Design a binder for this molecule. Structure first.
Ligand SMILES: *[C@@H]1O[C@H](CO)[C@@H](O[C@@H]2O[C@H](CO)[C@@H](O[C@@H]3O[C@H](CO[C@H]4O[C@H](CO)[C@@H](O)[C@H](O)[C@@H]4O)[C@@H](O)[C@H](O[C@H]4O[C@H](CO)[C@@H](O)[C@H](O)[C@@H]4O)[C@@H]3O)[C@H](O)[C@H]2NC(C)=O)[C@H](O)[C@H]1NC(C)=O
Ligand SMILES: *[C@@H]1O[C@H](CO)[C@@H](O[C@@H]2O[C@H](CO)[C@@H](O[C@@H]3O[C@H](CO[C@H]4O[C@H](CO)[C@@H](O)[C@H](O)[C@@H]4O)[C@@H](O)[C@H](O[C@H]4O[C@H](CO)[C@@H](O)[C@H](O)[C@@H]4O)[C@@H]3O)[C@H](O)[C@H]2NC(C)=O)[C@H](O)[C@H]1NC(C)=O
Ligand SMILES: *[C@@H]1O[C@H](CO)[C@@H](O[C@@H]2O[C@H](CO)[C@@H](O[C@@H]3O[C@H](CO[C@H]4O[C@H](CO)[C@@H](O)[C@H](O)[C@@H]4O)[C@@H](O)[C@H](O[C@H]4O[C@H](CO)[C@@H](O)[C@H](O)[C@@H]4O)[C@@H]3O)[C@H](O)[C@H]2NC(C)=O)[C@H](O)[C@H]1NC(C)=O
Ligand SMILES: *[C@@H]1O[C@H](CO)[C@@H](O[C@@H]2O[C@H](CO)[C@@H](O[C@@H]3O[C@H](CO[C@H]4O[C@H](CO)[C@@H](O)[C@H](O)[C@@H]4O)[C@@H](O)[C@H](O[C@H]4O[C@H](CO)[C@@H](O)[C@H](O)[C@@H]4O)[C@@H]3O)[C@H](O)[C@H]2NC(C)=O)[C@H](O)[C@H]1NC(C)=O
Ligand SMILES: *[C@@H]1O[C@H](CO)[C@@H](O[C@@H]2O[C@H](CO)[C@@H](O[C@@H]3O[C@H](CO)[C@@H](O)[C@H](O[C@H]4O[C@H](CO)[C@@H](O)[C@H](O)[C@@H]4O)[C@@H]3O)[C@H](O)[C@H]2NC(C)=O)[C@H](O)[C@H]1NC(C)=O
Ligand SMILES: *[C@@H]1O[C@H](CO)[C@@H](O[C@@H]2O[C@H](CO)[C@@H](O[C@@H]3O[C@H](CO)[C@@H](O)[C@H](O)[C@@H]3O)[C@H](O)[C@H]2NC(C)=O)[C@H](O)[C@H]1NC(C)=O
Ligand SMILES: *[C@@H]1O[C@H](CO)[C@@H](O[C@@H]2O[C@H](CO)[C@@H](O[C@@H]3O[C@H](CO)[C@@H](O)[C@H](O)[C@@H]3O)[C@H](O)[C@H]2NC(C)=O)[C@H](O)[C@H]1NC(C)=O
Lengths: 49, 322, 90, 223
């Protein structure tokens, strides 16, 4: 058999606890974060030419 | 009987704002994972401590209309439905004497956050209220089995005889006894109101928790011999190959602080468990029954007690014969 | 824009935020039960019929019971039973 | 009593044959031990910032100077792992030690005697208990008395007879279908209120809720 650890949240838990069976309850398996979008780059006024 | 259910993101604490740095953490495998596991374990225990101490009654009781029983005034101990706040006056007074979070939500940059409890203060108040309300009428059988009505005066008479005083004395002086009881309650209210030492023990626990967290975070600013405590300024300045040495050094330094932190938390948790165990015992033996062992439920000869909700603890009112 | 994410995942209408965090995929009822799988802030989750599904609910604190007070009468047992409790410690 | 006792034992026997949670506490300790051991050993494969997690893969391709440096890095890493383990082991020991002390206390108070303190040997009124051997632990069977269905009766703090106030002894004055008796609070057995099962103290005008009643005195049929 085999578990695809990135298929869905349930599969992730199975991989997390190294088992094909889960008895019951709530389990933390990983953390998460939001990915940044665009690039905001700022430079000084610049007057000196 | 508890401490904050803290949590720390082991990744964000050791190293963030870099995908290069992160590649070094991976050489330590599952370290980050087992560290996280340990902190969760402690938080779970905090829940257990609370439930064991308070949930000593199968059923919830509601507060009677009457607050006057045999001359005894219990209106200050019981909650009063008249007002929006489902708490006693004494409880409110007690509460008034004492990282990322959410009340709107907010998050810090330090990787720290604190989880909420399963049981909120009002839920606890419901339990303490139920216990007082229940025992007030159920008396001796409150915890033993079915709640059987016993006239307040008869509960008192029984307990006086328990200590060794013929019930005749109580009846003859019933008025006098009720007066002294009522007076004592008013006395306590003023004592708590105008003092600054009450519940010092609860403040102490909170202070200790804060210190541990403050220390953990502050050390993030330590260089540990590195070019800088700021990861972002190492890569910019130092050639990326050698930079791995600087980064690994900083990682090692910081890892040490997490290990220290978690270790201390386990130790603190142990002391709390001991307290909670005692509190649970006292609840059963001082409130749900009449303890005979000396100085367990107060200096004098135990007659009665009442629990009150408190900010991460339990407050007992011990009524004794002197 | 989320990391991590799963290959097969979607969000339904079962989304509701509580103080302890938001749930996705768990329904939400207006009733109460014994707390089975705790979430936090008075909220627990369990598996119930609707066909079953995961639901969120406000936990019950205990049984609903009330006795009238009397200064005139007393209640006493007129029978008894005996039972045996099992307890284990390491 | 004997009948219920025997059945209660049978009920437990059956319960312990089909359940899965009764010894969760013992299994938990065992699981924790296994996890700690596997964690420590597993870390042997950790790199710890070295060029290799394996000593042979360092010595076999490095001159002694650089090789020793990489080994030293490896050693430091592994030492910290073992130190971590033993610290945690002491913490675990402390909790168990406390449990053992409690267990010793419970046997002493619940088995080798009869507890008076409430909610220590069980929820009901302690009668008896028996130890049973268990893996890494102790299982107790606690036998308690539990009150059953109740009945309503009217009561009275005291009764007035011949102008004097009579007070109950260990029992309480109870009123049934048009008759007063005295009985123990924890059971029901309505005894005749007699002079030798009560006492007299004070008049009837110093008692709240006092009622008129009579007290039997054997002197009369004797005389
Ligand atoms: C258990 O014991 C408590 C007290 O220990 C009892 O509750 C108290 O009940 C008394 C009523 O007899 C409250 O009396 C307070 O009097 C204040 C003064 O004004 C009155 O008296 C002056 C005397 O010359 C008169 O001129 C004036 O017209 C009033 O008659 C009031 O200001 C107090 O009001 C409180 O409640 C109002 C409600 O909206 C608030 O706005 C006020 O700010 C204030 O809080 C009050 O009337 C006394 O305060 C009560 N105390 C408490 C703690 O409740 C319990 O009833 C007793 N229980 C049992 C079962 O016996
Ligand atoms: C110790 O004493 C307490 C009280 O001090 C007892 O509690 C009471 O128990 C009684 C048991 O019957 C409750 O009785 C109430 O009677 C009402 C009157 O109707 C009955 O009597 C008339 C007389 O001719 C008959 O014709 C009629 O058919 C009935 O027999 C009922 O209306 C009450 O019903 C309530 O509940 C139903 C539930 O759906 C509602 O629909 C009704 O509207 C109503 O709410 C009830 O039957 C009495 O109410 C109890 N009082 C309290 C405060 O609980 C204890 O039980 C007692 N303990 C022991 C061991 O004896
Ligand atoms: C246990 O706790 C309960 C509740 O607190 C107490 O019960 C109360 O006892 C009092 C004692 O009398 C009852 O008092 C009521 O007074 C009403 C007013 O009339 C009297 O007082 C005026 C004053 O000038 C006199 O002029 C007048 O002649 C009366 O003396 C009465 O109307 C009430 O009567 C009720 O029952 C009769 C029965 O047929 C009805 O016809 C009436 O309409 C009315 O229902 C009553 O006497 C008070 O009501 C009691 N409360 C309850 C809920 O019953 C217990 O006394 C206490 N136990 C002990 C030992 O103290
Ligand atoms: C158990 O059984 C005994 C015996 O049967 C009962 O004893 C009775 O107790 C009552 C107490 O209330 C006695 O009542 C007495 O009545 C006297 C007459 O005055 C009343 O009647 C006239 C009639 O027109 C009215 O005008 C007048 O206003 C009164 O209403 C009173 O004088 C007696 O007072 C006594 O005590 C006061 C207290 O300060 C003294 O100052 C008086 O001098 C006097 O001592 C009293 O009120 C009744 O007479 C008793 N019966 C007998 C045969 O003596 C118990 O009460 C009963 N107990 C119970 C619980 O049921
Ligand atoms: C309150 O308590 C009192 C006393 O504790 C209790 O009264 C008792 O009731 C029982 C009813 O079973 C009486 O038992 C009697 O026993 C004799 C001996 O065999 C019988 O002969 C009696 O029969 C009577 O009724 C028959 C009906 O047709 C008649 O034919 C016969 O001649 C008798 O009259 C009866 O069984 C017991 O003696 C009384 N005790 C006293 C002192 O009266 C009362 O019932 C209790 N009330 C409540 C609500 O619990
Ligand atoms: C999570 O983020 C959302 C989105 O910002 C928050 O929802 C917003 O909540 C406010 C207040 O409940 C809503 O009303 C706003 O009130 C301010 C008050 O001055 C007013 O100026 C605004 O014009 C508006 O009326 C706002 O509409 C609402 N936004 C949406 C899209 O519904 C939500 O509250 C946040 N959750 C937490 C726990 O903070
Ligand atoms: C307390 O309540 C219990 C039951 O809840 C009572 O025990 C029961 O007593 C009856 C005798 O009256 C026992 O025998 C039964 O007799 C009937 C008669 O027809 C029969 O149909 C039944 O099958 C049965 O044989 C019954 O077995 C018994 N219960 C048990 C578990 O043994 C008890 O007596 C009550 N105690 C007091 C003091 O009233």
């Amino acid at each position: 058999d085999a578990v695809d650890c990135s298929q869905n949240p349930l599969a992730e838990l199975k991989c997390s606890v190294k088992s094909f069976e889960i008895d019951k309850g709530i389990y933390q398996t990983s953390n998460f974060r939001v990915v940044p979008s665009g690039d905001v780059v700022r430079f000084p006024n610049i007057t000196n030419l | 009987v508890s401490m904050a259910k803290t949590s720390v993101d082991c990744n964000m604490y050791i190293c963030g704002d870099s995908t290069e740095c992160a590649n070094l953490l991976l050489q330590y495998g599952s370290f980050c994972t087992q560290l996280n596991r340990a902190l969760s374990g402690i938080a779970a225990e905090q829940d257990r401590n609370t439930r064991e101490v308070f949930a000593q009654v199968k059923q919830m009781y509601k507060t009677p209309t009457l607050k006057y029983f045999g001359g005894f005034n219990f209106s200050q101990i019981l909650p009063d439905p008249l007002k929006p706040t489902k708490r006693s006056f004494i409880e409110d007074l007690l509460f008034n004497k004492v990282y990322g979070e959410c009340l709107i939500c907010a998050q810090k940059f330090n990787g720290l956050t604190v989880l909420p409890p399963l049981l909120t203060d009002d839920m606890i108040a419901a339990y303490t209220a139920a216990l007082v309300s229940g025992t007030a009428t159920a008396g001796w059988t409150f915890g033993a089995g079915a709640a059987l009505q016993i006239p307040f005066a008869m509960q008192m008479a029984y307990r006086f005889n328990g200590i060794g005083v013929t019930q005749n004395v109580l009846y003859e002086n019933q008025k006098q006894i009720a007066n002294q009881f009522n007076k004592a309650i008013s006395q306590i209210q003023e004592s708590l109101t105008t003092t600054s030492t009450a519940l010092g023990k609860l403040q102490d626990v909170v202070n200790q928790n804060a210190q541990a967290l403050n220390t953990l975070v502050k050390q993030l600013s330590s260089n540990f011999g590195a070019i800088s405590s700021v990861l972002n300024d190492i890569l910019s300045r130092l050639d990326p190959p050698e930079a791995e040495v600087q980064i690994d050094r900083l990682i090692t330094g910081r890892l040490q602080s997490l290990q220290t932190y978690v270790t201390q938390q386990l130790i603190r948790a142990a002391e709390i468990r001991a307290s909670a165990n005692l509190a649970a015992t006292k609840m059963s033996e001082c409130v749900l029954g009449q303890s005979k062992r000396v100085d367990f439920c107060g200096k004098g000869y135990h007659l009665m007690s009442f629990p009150q909700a408190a900010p991460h603890g339990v407050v007992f009112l011990h009524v004794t014969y002197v | 824009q989320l990391t991590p994410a799963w290959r097969i995942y979607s969000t339904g209408n079962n989304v509701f935020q509580t103080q302890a965090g938001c749930l996705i995929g768990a329904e939400h009822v207006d009733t109460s039960y014994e707390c089975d799988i705790p979430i936090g802030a008075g909220i627990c989750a369990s598996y119930h019929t609707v066909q079953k599904s995961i639901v969120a609910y406000t936990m019950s604190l205990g049984a609903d019971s009330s006795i009238a007070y009397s200064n005139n009468t007393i209640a006493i047992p007129t029978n008894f039973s005996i039972s045996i409790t099992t307890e284990v410690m390491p | 009593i004997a009948n219920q006792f025997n059945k209660a034992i049978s009920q437990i026997q059956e319960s312990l044959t089909t359940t899965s949670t009764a010894l969760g506490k013992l299994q938990d300790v065992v699981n924790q031990n296994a996890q700690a051991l596997n964690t420590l050993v597993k870390q042997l494969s950790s790199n710890f910032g070295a060029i290799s997690s394996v000593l042979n893969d360092i010595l076999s391709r490095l001159d002694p100077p650089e090789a020793e440096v990489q080994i030293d890095r490896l050693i430091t890493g592994r030492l910290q792992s073992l130190q971590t383990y033993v610290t945690q082991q002491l913490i675990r020991a402390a909790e168990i030690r406390a449990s053992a002390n409690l267990a010793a206390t419970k046997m002493s108070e619940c088995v080798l005697g009869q507890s008076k303190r409430v909610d220590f040997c069980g929820k009901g009124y302690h009668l008896m208990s028996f130890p049973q051997a268990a893996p890494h632990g102790v299982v107790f069977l606690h036998v308690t008395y539990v009150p059953s269905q109740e009945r309503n009766f009217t009561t009275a703090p005291a009764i007035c007879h011949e102008g004097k106030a009579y007070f109950p002894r260990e029992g309480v004055f109870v009123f049934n279908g048009t008759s007063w008796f005295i009985t123990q609070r924890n059971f029901f057995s309505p005894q005749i209120i007699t002079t030798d099962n009560t006492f007299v103290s004070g008049n009837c005008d110093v008692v709240i809720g006092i009622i008129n009643n009579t007290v039997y005195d054997p002197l009369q049929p004797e005389l």
